[PDB]
Amino acid sequence: QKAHSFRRKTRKKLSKHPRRRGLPPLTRFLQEFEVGQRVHIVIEPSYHKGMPDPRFHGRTGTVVGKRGEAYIVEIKDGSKVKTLFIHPVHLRPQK
């Protein structure tokens, strides 16, 4: 936009409020999702690992299963069906 990495223009998504700062609580990380379950994908700024591309933030997909510790979530980004590999930390149950 000048330039095209993932992290471009994600100053805002990637930043936490000063209050929210600090290493994130452990519950959100442990969280368990079931397949057919729809999960919201939101990057937790405080947790480095498990992250998706930041462009995806605000998306709602369905957990199709898991690879290793992470979960594999199906989303449709525009026309294309995509797979986003994301840890439970950056996932929240819908509803």
Partner: protein
């Protein structure tokens, strides 16, 4: 966070000076129960705790004031061998609740041998619980049995002052254990298994 709306959110346990949230998340990740061994100046507690979002559930407890009743223990509740028989006492209820696999949560404290946390773990492994460990951690024999102390107590002794060693301060002031006898330990250790033989 301090006096204004500045960086970092404090936590409850972080304010008290307790268990590190990071350590406890690593332990929890596998989906195995935590065998919570925690320390006090004259108590030892072991608990088999699971995680929930509600707040933890403790499946069975075992404590030093439910050991000083009706197990022939009338020993000091803070020594290393009490912790030995705490592991045994939560060992009869892993055979009546049937969950035998848990991993050792020492909380914050450095892991080195000679400590209380290895002694209760040692008592649990003989009770017949299968918990992950590598054997290079167990206190020496002297420590478990309690006989380091009988020998120590003769060295010192309070309420007798001489040029010979009759040094002042704790040694087991108590009459019911002058010096603590490893026979006593073996009686209570005989309560082993769920049969109490």
């Amino acid at each position: 966070m301090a006096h204004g709306p500045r960086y970092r959110v404090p936590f409850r346990r972080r304010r008290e000076g307790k268990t590190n949230y990071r350590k406890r998340l690593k332990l929890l990740k596998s989906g195995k129960p935590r065998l919570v061994v925690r320390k006090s100046l004259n108590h030892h507690i072991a608990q088999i705790i699971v995680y929930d979002p509600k707040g933890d559930r403790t499946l069975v407890s075992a404590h030093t004031r439910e050991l000083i009743r009706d197990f022939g223990w009338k020993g000091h509740c803070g020594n290393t061998p009490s912790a030995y028989l705490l592991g045994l006492l939560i060992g009869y209820k892993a055979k009546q609740a049937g969950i035998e696999e848990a991993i050792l949560d020492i909380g914050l404290h450095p892991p080195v041998r000679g400590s209380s946390v290895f002694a209760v773990l040692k008592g649990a492994v003989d009770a017949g619980l299968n918990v992950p460990h590598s054997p290079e951690i167990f206190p020496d024999e002297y420590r478990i049995r309690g006989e380091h102390i009988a020998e120590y107590a003769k060295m010192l002794k309070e309420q007798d002052e001489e040029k010979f060693r009759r040094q002042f301060g704790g040694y087991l002031v108590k009459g019911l254990d002058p010096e603590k006898l490893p026979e006593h330990f073996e009686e209570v250790k005989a309560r082993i298994i769920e049969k109490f033989e």
